[PDB]
Amino acid sequence: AVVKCKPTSPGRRHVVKVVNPELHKGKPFAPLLEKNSKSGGRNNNGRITTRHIGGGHKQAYRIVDFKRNKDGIPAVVERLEYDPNRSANIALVLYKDGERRYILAPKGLKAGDQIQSGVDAAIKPGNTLPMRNIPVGSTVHNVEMKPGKGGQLARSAGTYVQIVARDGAYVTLRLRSGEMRKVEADCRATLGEVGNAEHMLRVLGKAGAARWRGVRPTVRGTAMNPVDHPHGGGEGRNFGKHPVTPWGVQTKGKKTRSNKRTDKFIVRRRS
RNA sequence: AGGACCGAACCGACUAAUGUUGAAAAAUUAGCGGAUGACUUGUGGCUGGGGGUGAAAGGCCAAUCAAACCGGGAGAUAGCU
RNA sequence: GCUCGCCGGAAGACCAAGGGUUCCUGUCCAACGUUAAUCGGGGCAGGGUGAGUCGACCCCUAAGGCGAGGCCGAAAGGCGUAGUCGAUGGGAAACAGGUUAAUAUUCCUGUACUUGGUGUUACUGCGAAGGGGGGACGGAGAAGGCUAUGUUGGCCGGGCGACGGUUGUCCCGGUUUAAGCGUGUAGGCUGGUUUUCCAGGCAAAUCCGGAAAAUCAAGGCUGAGGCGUGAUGACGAGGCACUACGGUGCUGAAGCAACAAAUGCCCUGCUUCCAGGAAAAGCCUCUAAGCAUCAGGUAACAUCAAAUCGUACCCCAAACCGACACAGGUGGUCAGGUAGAGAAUACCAAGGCGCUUGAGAGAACUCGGGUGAAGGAACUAGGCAAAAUGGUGCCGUAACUUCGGGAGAAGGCACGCUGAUAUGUAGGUGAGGUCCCUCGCGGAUGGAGCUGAAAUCAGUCGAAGAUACCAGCUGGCUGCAACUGUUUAUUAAAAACACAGCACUGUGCAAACACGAAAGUGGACGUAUACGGUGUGACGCCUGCCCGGUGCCGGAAGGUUAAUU
RNA sequence: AAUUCCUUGUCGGGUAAGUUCCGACCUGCACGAAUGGCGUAAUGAUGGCCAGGCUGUCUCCACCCGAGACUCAGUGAAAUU
RNA sequence: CUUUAAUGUUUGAUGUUCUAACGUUGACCCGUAAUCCGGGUUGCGGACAGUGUCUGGUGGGUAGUUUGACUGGGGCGGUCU
C-alpha cells in the first residue's frame, strides 16, 4: 500500500512508500538467476553513450518467461517476489510437471491461483493465448509483436493494451501511449493488467534515493559553457537561443521518427 | 527508522597567524566542517587529444590544459626587437 | 653505566605494496653525514635468507583483455564466437617450545595433520566437456552466551627497609603451557522414514523437482567455548658447578580460584528494511555413451612422493613516492594499566627514543605564549584575532511551525572527601550441599564467597569540589538558497552545481538517442507507471495577456523550383 | 529590492550622533509570474544589522617565560653586479 | 492527306494482387557440448525498405577565414575621388 513517512528528518517529509506484504520476505529462486554486471552507460568502446547512468545497488537478473509457450500444462502460483530489473513484480509458478518459472504478476494474482497457456485456455487474468481467440475489446499485457519471440508490449507496473478490432490475420490495439497499432493474430498475449499500479504513486523524497536506482545527476546545459553545449553560457542566465539537445537538435516538439520500414503497422500514431 | 544529533579514527579544507631564496614548487600551528552515507578506502580494469571525463569551475586528463606530452613537417613565418 | 626528559591507538610491534643487501661481523674516515667523528643506512672484505603445511606457482573464475574460424573495414585494422588469459575473490594440511653475531610455524626437540602414486587384502556398479545439489554472498539493529585480556584473592619464593614508623589487613616478583585427538554443550535451521506414480531438468537417471499414500515423532545437519587428553613433559622466578663476568651444563618451588570483560568468536545466525544483495571450480551426488571372472570404485594396512621460486632488512619511514638523512604523503594486523562514556584526553607499562652543529649572553625588533590597574569594541572595512562559554543530573524553556521540530532554546540549583543508613545496600555473579534425573557440559533448590552502583542524612577542609587535560558563547531582526551534499588539486565553498518534485517534448522496440567509415555495442537481456532530452527547482497559494517575428508541428488550391529528358 | 541613476529618496524605529540595518510609502531611471512570482518552519564554516557576556581590539601599553636576533668555535649559501 | 472508335503491339500514370530478387536484432534443424557467423526448412514483410551515383533543401553540428585607414592616444562620430 501507499504509505507516507513522517518528517523525522529532512529527506523523509515527501518520501512515499509502496509496501506489499504479499511479496516473498526471503531469497528468490536461484536456478532462475543470472549475473548482471552494470555498465555505467558505456559500450564496448568505453565511451558514455547514455548519460545519467552509474552506480546503484547490485542486482541479479531473474529469468522471466515472456513467451509462455508451455501450453496444455496448468501452473499454480507459489509466491510473489520483488524484481529490481523491472518496475513490476514477478510471480513464481509451479507447473504440474515439476518445472518452475518466473512470470509477470498481473493485477489480481495471488498465491495458489491457477493459470494456463495455449489456445484452449480459459479467459481469465494470467492465462496466455494467441490474440486470434481473445475476444475483441478485452485487455491484455505482455503482448508479442512477432509470433514466438516473446512479449514486448505492456510489461511495466500498471500497463495494458486493449484489443479494439480484428480484420484478418491482424488485430488492432491501442497501446498505453494511445498509439493504434496492428499486429498478427498469432502473437500470444496474457489476460489482464500488470499489477503494481501504485508504483507510480511512489515518491523518492531525496537525491540518494535516485542514486540507488543507478541514476546519476543531470546537469542542465544552460550553465555549462559554449564549448560544452549550445546553450552554453552568458553573463548570468541569458539563454537567448532555441532549446536544443547536445549535437544540435530541437528537443521541444521536433519529431525524430524516420523508420519508413514499419509504418504499415501503425494505424493512428498518438495525440 | 534516519542522505538524523554530539563527537575520535578516516575523509575534507571555512578563518587567522607563520612561512614566502620556506621544513614543504600550496605546508605547519590553533580553531573549523562531514563523520551509516549522494560516505570513504585498497588492488586491478576501461574511457586518448578537437577527444576523454566533468553534481559544470572552462575544471581535471603524470607539479604542464580555451585543446596534454614526445618526435616529425621545421632552419614554420616574424614588414617587429 | 647512573640519573633526567619524550611517544606510548605510537615517535611501540608484525606485514603488503615499493625498494633491493640498506641485514650481521671485522676493518677504514679522503669523499658522503648541513659541525667534529674513534660512529653510521658511508668505503673495503667476508658472512647471512634452509618450508609437503606461510606465500607464490597451481586448480576456478569477476570486471576486463587477447581472440582459431567468422562479420566488418581503402591498407593499417576494428568487433567478437568457440576458447584462452586475467585477483583485489573461492579452493587440502603445523602447533608450542628451544636455538644463530645475523634465518626460522622453514633448522633442532616433542606432538600432529593434508593431498596423491604404488602394492597387498577384503568387499563391490564403475563411468562425462552432460543433469542436479552445494559452494553462494546485502544493509541496519538487537541482545544473549563465550573468550582474548585484565583486576583481586589465595599459593610459592624472596624481603623487613639510607629518615619518623613498618613480623603485618605489610612490600616485590611469579603463578605460564599450543595445534591436534576425544567429548558435541550454550545455542540456530530443519519434521523425518518407507512404497508407488510422473507432459519437467536438451537424451537418460536410483539424483533434483513434482504428485499421492502409509507409518513415526524423534531424526539429522551446523555449532563458539568449556572439560579431558596432548603434558610423569616443556617453560618457570631463582639456585647448585664452571663462570675470559661474553655465558654454558645439571637442578629448578607454586603453577589454583573468583570477578570483570571486548569493536573479537558462536554469527555465512536471529530479527528487520528496501535500494532486493558476484561468478566458476574443488567437494557431494546422478546417470549416458561405454567397460564387467577385467577395468575402475570403497575401506584397511604398508610404502613412496609432495617438486620449483620467494623468505635477509626498512616498511607512517634516514631504506617506498616527494631532487635532500625533506616538519609532507603511504594500505592492513596487534590494541596493556589508572581516571574516563570512549581507539578522546592526561600520566604510565612492554618497548622505543631525545629528532647529526654546540657554547655563552640575556639589547632593539620578530615569532610562539603567560599575567594585567581603571575603562570594556571607544579598535577596525568588519568584534580579524583573542578572551569567554564548555560536563552530569534534576527543575524549567518563547515567537513561529510542514506538529517532526525550534531545543542542549534561554534560564536556575546541586556536584569534593569521611562516616552512617548497609562492619559493601539495591543489583549482578554464583560455589558447596540438598532434591530430582531421560544418571548429563542436566534441572530445581540453595545461597556461601566475589563484585558493586546511585541516593539520603550527618559531619569536615579549602578563596575555589564539572577544581587539571578534556569540554556548546547566547539571544533578536533580515537577504539568498528548501534541506544532506557537489565545485575552480595550487588566491573564489558561495546566493553557483546537484537535488527530490513539477512541466513540455521525443521515443511502439531492429525505439528515440549516442559511440562507431561499417560490423556492432550501449540504451536494455528494459518495453510508454519505460527510456532520452530541455527547462524549473522541496512544500504552500498561484503561474495572467500576446502566435506579428524566429523555431517547431500540421494542411494544400496555386505559384516558384534540381538532377533528369 | 542581490534590481532605484537622481539618492545618504521620504517618514518612523533603534544610537548622544546610524550613507549600513528593520518597518511602511511608490515617484518601479530599468520587478513580475516555471531563463518561474510571492510567501515559507528547519538548515547553512553563507551576506548584512542590533544586543547581553567577554576580553590588551583599543585608550596605552607594562612585565615575564621560551625560540631566533647578538658573541665565540665548526661547516658554509643566494638573488644581484 | 483534314476526321474517330473496339483491337494488336507500344510504352507512361494510378490502384489491387502475387513471389522469385532483397530484408528478417521470428521459430525450428545441422555444423556444434557456441544467444557469434553460415547453411537449410518455414513463417512474416516484399519489389516497399535499405545501400550506391547524381541532385535540391536544411545545416556554427564541425572546419578554414574575413571583420579598413586617417585620427592632437584609441574608440564613437566625421572623413576618404
Side-chain angles (χ1 to χ4, degrees):
Chain A
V2 65
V3 167
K4 179 162 188 285
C5 302
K6 290 197 162 184
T8 51
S9 62
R12 299 279 296 185
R13 318 194 74 106
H14 318 277
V15 65
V16 175
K17 293 256 207 92
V18 166
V19 310
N20 187 344
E22 304 184 345
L23 303 184
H24 190 40
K25 282 177 182 175
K27 306 297 180 178
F29 201 61
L32 296 168
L33 292 191
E34 287 222 330
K35 178 176 60 42
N36 195 16
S37 59
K38 292 167 285 192
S39 62
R42 298 161 172 72
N43 60 343
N44 52 12
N45 288 341
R47 302 277 186 90
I48 295 173
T49 69
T50 312
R51 318 186 304 175
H52 314 338
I53 312 186
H57 200 110
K58 207 175 187 181
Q59 288 174 345
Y61 183 66
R62 281 85 159 166
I63 292 166
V64 181
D65 183 61
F66 301 110
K67 299 187 173 186
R68 293 282 295 288
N69 48 354
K70 272 246 287 182
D71 317 334
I73 316 183
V76 75
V77 185
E78 276 195 347
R79 75 210 185 193
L80 276 274
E81 295 190 357
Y82 174 89
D83 198 3
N85 309 275
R86 59 200 64 262
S87 35
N89 300 316
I90 51 175
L92 184 66
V93 306
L94 174 61
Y95 287 82
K96 277 286 183 175
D97 59 355
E99 183 170 356
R100 282 179 166 89
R101 284 187 182 183
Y102 278 124
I103 67 172
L104 304 186
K107 200 183 194 309
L109 215 68
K110 308 174 293 186
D113 291 350
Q114 272 203 335
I115 70 195
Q116 192 170 333
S117 44
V119 299
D120 55 356
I123 310 299
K124 101 177 73 179
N127 287 337
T128 304
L129 315 97
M131 270 167 282
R132 187 182 299 283
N133 303 297
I134 306 288
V136 181
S138 75
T139 278
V140 291
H141 69 282
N142 195 38
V143 186
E144 268 176 12
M145 297 165 69
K146 289 178 73 172
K149 57 144 53 163
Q152 299 179 285
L153 314 159
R155 281 168 38 161
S156 180
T159 314
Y160 60 93
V161 310
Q162 193 199 341
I163 307 182
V164 52
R166 160 152 43 90
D167 52 69
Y170 285 94
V171 301
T172 317
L173 322 164
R174 52 144 46 83
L175 289 66
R176 203 51 158 67
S177 47
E179 179 164 316
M180 199 68 60
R181 182 172 178 91
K182 89 202 310 183
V183 299
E184 278 143 85
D186 289 46
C187 282
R188 294 175 172 281
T190 312
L191 276 297
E193 317 178 12
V194 196
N196 203 351
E198 54 183 357
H199 152 280
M200 63 190 306
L201 310 184
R202 177 172 38 64
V203 185
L204 308 183
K206 65 173 195 173
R211 308 287 263 98
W212 308 332
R213 309 308 211 292
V215 177
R216 276 187 50 72
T218 296
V219 54
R220 285 168 288 148
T222 327
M224 227 191 218
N225 307 302
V227 65
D228 304 315
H229 197 284
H231 304 162
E235 296 291 341
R237 313 203 180 99
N238 299 133
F239 197 94
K241 65 203 86 186
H242 288 108
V244 84
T245 0
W247 317 286
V249 191
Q250 192 85 0
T251 63
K252 199 119 293 183
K254 170 158 185 308
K255 297 182 168 290
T256 185
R257 180 184 207 270
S258 91
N259 201 252
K260 208 111 88 116
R261 155 178 74 110
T262 164
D263 273 7
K264 63 203 158 226
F265 303 135
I266 291 264
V267 181
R268 173 115 102 319
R269 182 89 204 292
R270 49 184 213 269
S271 181

Short mmCIF file of all heavy atoms in Angstrom, two decimals, chain A residues 158-187:
data_model
loop_
_atom_site.label_atom_id
_atom_site.label_comp_id
_atom_site.label_asym_id
_atom_site.label_seq_id
_atom_site.Cartn_x
_atom_site.Cartn_y
_atom_site.Cartn_z
N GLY A 158 1.71 -0.90 -14.26
CA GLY A 158 0.27 -0.97 -14.42
C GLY A 158 -0.17 -0.74 -15.85
O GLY A 158 -1.18 -0.08 -16.10
N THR A 159 0.58 -1.28 -16.80
CA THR A 159 0.36 -1.05 -18.21
C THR A 159 -0.48 -2.18 -18.81
O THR A 159 -0.51 -3.31 -18.31
CB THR A 159 1.69 -0.93 -18.95
OG1 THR A 159 2.56 -0.07 -18.22
CG2 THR A 159 1.48 -0.36 -20.34
N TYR A 160 -1.16 -1.85 -19.90
CA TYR A 160 -2.02 -2.79 -20.59
C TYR A 160 -2.35 -2.23 -21.97
O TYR A 160 -2.11 -1.06 -22.25
CB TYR A 160 -3.31 -3.05 -19.81
CG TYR A 160 -4.13 -1.81 -19.58
CD1 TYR A 160 -5.13 -1.44 -20.45
CD2 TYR A 160 -3.89 -0.99 -18.48
CE1 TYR A 160 -5.88 -0.31 -20.25
CE2 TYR A 160 -4.63 0.15 -18.27
CZ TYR A 160 -5.62 0.49 -19.15
OH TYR A 160 -6.37 1.62 -18.94
N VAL A 161 -2.89 -3.10 -22.82
CA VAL A 161 -3.40 -2.70 -24.12
C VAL A 161 -4.79 -3.29 -24.28
O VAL A 161 -5.16 -4.28 -23.63
CB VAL A 161 -2.48 -3.13 -25.28
CG1 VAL A 161 -1.05 -2.72 -24.99
CG2 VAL A 161 -2.57 -4.61 -25.50
N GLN A 162 -5.57 -2.68 -25.16
CA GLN A 162 -6.97 -3.04 -25.38
C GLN A 162 -7.15 -3.46 -26.82
O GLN A 162 -6.93 -2.66 -27.74
CB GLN A 162 -7.89 -1.87 -25.04
CG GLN A 162 -9.35 -2.26 -24.92
CD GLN A 162 -10.28 -1.07 -25.05
OE1 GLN A 162 -9.86 0.08 -24.89
NE2 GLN A 162 -11.54 -1.33 -25.35
N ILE A 163 -7.54 -4.72 -27.03
CA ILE A 163 -7.85 -5.19 -28.37
C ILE A 163 -9.12 -4.51 -28.84
O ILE A 163 -10.19 -4.68 -28.26
CB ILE A 163 -7.99 -6.72 -28.40
CG1 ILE A 163 -6.76 -7.37 -27.77
CG2 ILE A 163 -8.17 -7.21 -29.82
CD1 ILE A 163 -6.79 -8.88 -27.80
N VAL A 164 -9.00 -3.73 -29.92
CA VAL A 164 -10.11 -2.93 -30.40
C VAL A 164 -10.74 -3.50 -31.67
O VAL A 164 -11.90 -3.16 -31.97
CB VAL A 164 -9.68 -1.46 -30.63
CG1 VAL A 164 -8.45 -1.40 -31.50
CG2 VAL A 164 -10.81 -0.66 -31.24
N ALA A 165 -10.05 -4.36 -32.41
CA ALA A 165 -10.61 -4.89 -33.64
C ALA A 165 -9.80 -6.08 -34.12
O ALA A 165 -8.73 -6.39 -33.59
CB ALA A 165 -10.65 -3.82 -34.74
N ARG A 166 -10.34 -6.75 -35.13
CA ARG A 166 -9.68 -7.89 -35.76
C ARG A 166 -10.23 -8.01 -37.17
O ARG A 166 -11.40 -8.35 -37.35
CB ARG A 166 -9.89 -9.18 -34.97
CG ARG A 166 -9.66 -10.44 -35.78
CD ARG A 166 -9.20 -11.61 -34.91
NE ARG A 166 -9.94 -11.71 -33.65
CZ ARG A 166 -11.05 -12.41 -33.48
NH1 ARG A 166 -11.59 -13.09 -34.49
NH2 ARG A 166 -11.64 -12.44 -32.30
N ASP A 167 -9.39 -7.73 -38.17
CA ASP A 167 -9.81 -7.75 -39.56
C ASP A 167 -9.54 -9.11 -40.20
O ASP A 167 -10.46 -9.78 -40.68
CB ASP A 167 -9.10 -6.64 -40.35
CG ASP A 167 -7.59 -6.68 -40.17
OD1 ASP A 167 -6.96 -7.63 -40.67
OD2 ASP A 167 -7.04 -5.78 -39.50
N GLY A 168 -8.28 -9.53 -40.20
CA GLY A 168 -7.87 -10.81 -40.74
C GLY A 168 -6.82 -11.47 -39.88
O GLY A 168 -7.02 -11.69 -38.68
N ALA A 169 -5.69 -11.81 -40.48
CA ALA A 169 -4.55 -12.30 -39.71
C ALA A 169 -3.95 -11.24 -38.83
O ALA A 169 -2.92 -11.50 -38.20
CB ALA A 169 -3.48 -12.86 -40.65
N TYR A 170 -4.56 -10.06 -38.78
CA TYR A 170 -4.10 -8.96 -37.95
C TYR A 170 -5.19 -8.57 -36.97
O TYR A 170 -6.37 -8.86 -37.16
CB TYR A 170 -3.71 -7.76 -38.81
CG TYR A 170 -2.40 -7.95 -39.53
CD1 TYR A 170 -2.36 -8.44 -40.82
CD2 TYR A 170 -1.20 -7.65 -38.90
CE1 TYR A 170 -1.15 -8.62 -41.48
CE2 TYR A 170 0.00 -7.83 -39.54
CZ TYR A 170 0.02 -8.31 -40.83
OH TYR A 170 1.22 -8.49 -41.48
N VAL A 171 -4.78 -7.91 -35.89
CA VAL A 171 -5.69 -7.33 -34.91
C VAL A 171 -5.15 -5.96 -34.53
O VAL A 171 -3.94 -5.76 -34.46
CB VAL A 171 -5.86 -8.21 -33.66
CG1 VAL A 171 -6.38 -9.58 -34.03
CG2 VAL A 171 -4.55 -8.32 -32.92
N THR A 172 -6.06 -5.02 -34.29
CA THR A 172 -5.69 -3.66 -33.94
C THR A 172 -5.72 -3.47 -32.43
O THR A 172 -6.62 -3.97 -31.75
CB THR A 172 -6.63 -2.66 -34.61
OG1 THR A 172 -6.85 -3.06 -35.97
CG2 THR A 172 -6.02 -1.28 -34.60
N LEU A 173 -4.73 -2.75 -31.92
CA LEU A 173 -4.59 -2.50 -30.49
C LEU A 173 -4.37 -1.01 -30.25
O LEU A 173 -3.82 -0.31 -31.10
CB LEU A 173 -3.43 -3.28 -29.89
CG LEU A 173 -3.18 -4.69 -30.41
CD1 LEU A 173 -1.80 -5.16 -30.01
CD2 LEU A 173 -4.23 -5.65 -29.89
N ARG A 174 -4.79 -0.55 -29.08
CA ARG A 174 -4.48 0.80 -28.60
C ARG A 174 -3.54 0.66 -27.41
O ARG A 174 -3.94 0.17 -26.35
CB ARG A 174 -5.74 1.57 -28.22
CG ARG A 174 -6.67 0.86 -27.26
CD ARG A 174 -7.31 1.85 -26.30
NE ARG A 174 -7.80 3.04 -26.99
CZ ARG A 174 -8.98 3.11 -27.61
NH1 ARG A 174 -9.79 2.06 -27.63
NH2 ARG A 174 -9.34 4.23 -28.21
N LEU A 175 -2.30 1.08 -27.60
CA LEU A 175 -1.30 0.95 -26.56
C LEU A 175 -1.49 2.03 -25.50
O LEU A 175 -2.22 3.01 -25.70
CB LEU A 175 0.10 1.01 -27.16
CG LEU A 175 0.52 -0.21 -27.98
CD1 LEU A 175 -0.32 -0.34 -29.22
CD2 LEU A 175 1.98 -0.13 -28.36
N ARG A 176 -0.81 1.86 -24.37
CA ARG A 176 -0.95 2.80 -23.26
C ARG A 176 -0.52 4.20 -23.65
O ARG A 176 -0.82 5.16 -22.93
CB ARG A 176 -0.15 2.30 -22.06
CG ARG A 176 -0.61 2.85 -20.71
CD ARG A 176 -2.10 2.67 -20.48
NE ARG A 176 -2.46 2.70 -19.07
CZ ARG A 176 -2.36 3.77 -18.29
NH1 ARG A 176 -1.90 4.91 -18.78
NH2 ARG A 176 -2.72 3.70 -17.02
N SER A 177 0.17 4.35 -24.78
CA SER A 177 0.55 5.65 -25.31
C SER A 177 -0.53 6.25 -26.20
O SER A 177 -0.37 7.39 -26.65
CB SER A 177 1.85 5.53 -26.11
OG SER A 177 1.79 4.43 -26.99
N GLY A 178 -1.61 5.53 -26.45
CA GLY A 178 -2.64 5.98 -27.36
C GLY A 178 -2.43 5.57 -28.80
O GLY A 178 -3.34 5.74 -29.62
N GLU A 179 -1.26 5.05 -29.14
CA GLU A 179 -0.99 4.62 -30.50
C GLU A 179 -1.88 3.43 -30.87
O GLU A 179 -2.08 2.52 -30.07
CB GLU A 179 0.48 4.24 -30.66
CG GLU A 179 0.85 3.76 -32.04
CD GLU A 179 2.34 3.76 -32.28
OE1 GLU A 179 3.01 4.74 -31.89
OE2 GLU A 179 2.85 2.77 -32.85
N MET A 180 -2.39 3.46 -32.09
CA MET A 180 -3.27 2.41 -32.60
C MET A 180 -2.46 1.55 -33.56
O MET A 180 -2.36 1.83 -34.75
CB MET A 180 -4.49 3.02 -33.28
CG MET A 180 -5.66 2.07 -33.43
SD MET A 180 -6.41 1.61 -31.86
CE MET A 180 -6.91 3.21 -31.25
N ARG A 181 -1.88 0.49 -33.02
CA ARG A 181 -1.05 -0.43 -33.78
C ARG A 181 -1.83 -1.71 -34.10
O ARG A 181 -2.81 -2.05 -33.44
CB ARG A 181 0.22 -0.78 -33.01
CG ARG A 181 1.16 -1.71 -33.75
CD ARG A 181 2.47 -1.87 -33.04
NE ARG A 181 3.35 -2.81 -33.74
CZ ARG A 181 4.23 -2.46 -34.67
NH1 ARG A 181 4.38 -1.19 -35.02
NH2 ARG A 181 4.97 -3.39 -35.25
N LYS A 182 -1.36 -2.40 -35.14
CA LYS A 182 -1.93 -3.68 -35.54
C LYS A 182 -0.82 -4.71 -35.67
O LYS A 182 0.23 -4.41 -36.24
CB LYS A 182 -2.71 -3.56 -36.86
CG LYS A 182 -1.88 -3.76 -38.11
CD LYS A 182 -2.52 -3.11 -39.32
CE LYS A 182 -3.98 -3.50 -39.48
NZ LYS A 182 -4.58 -2.92 -40.71
N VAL A 183 -1.05 -5.90 -35.13
CA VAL A 183 -0.09 -6.99 -35.20
C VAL A 183 -0.82 -8.25 -35.64
O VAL A 183 -2.05 -8.31 -35.68
CB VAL A 183 0.63 -7.24 -33.85
CG1 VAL A 183 1.41 -6.01 -33.44
CG2 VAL A 183 -0.36 -7.62 -32.78
N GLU A 184 -0.04 -9.27 -35.97
CA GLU A 184 -0.60 -10.52 -36.46
C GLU A 184 -1.51 -11.15 -35.41
O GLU A 184 -1.31 -10.99 -34.21
CB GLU A 184 0.52 -11.49 -36.84
CG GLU A 184 1.10 -11.25 -38.22
CD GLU A 184 2.60 -11.50 -38.26
OE1 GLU A 184 3.00 -12.67 -38.45
OE2 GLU A 184 3.37 -10.53 -38.11
N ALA A 185 -2.51 -11.88 -35.88
CA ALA A 185 -3.40 -12.62 -34.99
C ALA A 185 -2.84 -14.01 -34.70
O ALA A 185 -3.52 -15.03 -34.77
CB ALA A 185 -4.79 -12.72 -35.60
N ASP A 186 -1.56 -14.03 -34.35
CA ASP A 186 -0.89 -15.23 -33.85
C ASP A 186 0.00 -14.92 -32.66
O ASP A 186 0.48 -15.86 -32.02
CB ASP A 186 -0.05 -15.89 -34.95
CG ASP A 186 -0.89 -16.54 -36.03
OD1 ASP A 186 -1.85 -15.91 -36.50
OD2 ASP A 186 -0.57 -17.68 -36.41
N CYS A 187 0.24 -13.65 -32.35
CA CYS A 187 1.07 -13.27 -31.23
C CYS A 187 0.35 -13.55 -29.92
O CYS A 187 -0.79 -13.12 -29.73
CB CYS A 187 1.44 -11.79 -31.33
SG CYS A 187 2.76 -11.43 -32.50
#
